[PDB]
């Protein structure tokens, strides 16, 4: 359940959460998001996330 923040905007990856609207279920580890995934609120790639 390791937590990712997006070092562009300051959003949290949630893995309890997931991310629906990105066809990302609840439960999925960030590692396991593809690679093309994007920042909800700003639009930065996955690999501009963090661990928080
Ligand atoms: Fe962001």
């Known amino acids: 359940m390791d937590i ?4 562009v ?3 949290e990856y949630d893995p309890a959460k997931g991310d629906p609207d990105s ?3 609840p439960g999925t580890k960030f590692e396991d998001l593809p690679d ?3 920042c909800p ?4 790639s996955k ?3 963090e661990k928080q």
């Open 23 to 25: 066809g990302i279920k």
């Open 9 to 11: 905007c300051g959003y």
């Open 47 to 49: 690999d501009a996330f």
């Open 36 to 38: 093309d995934w994007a």
């Open 4 to 7: 990712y923040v997006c070092t």
């Open 41 to 44: 609120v700003c639009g930065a």
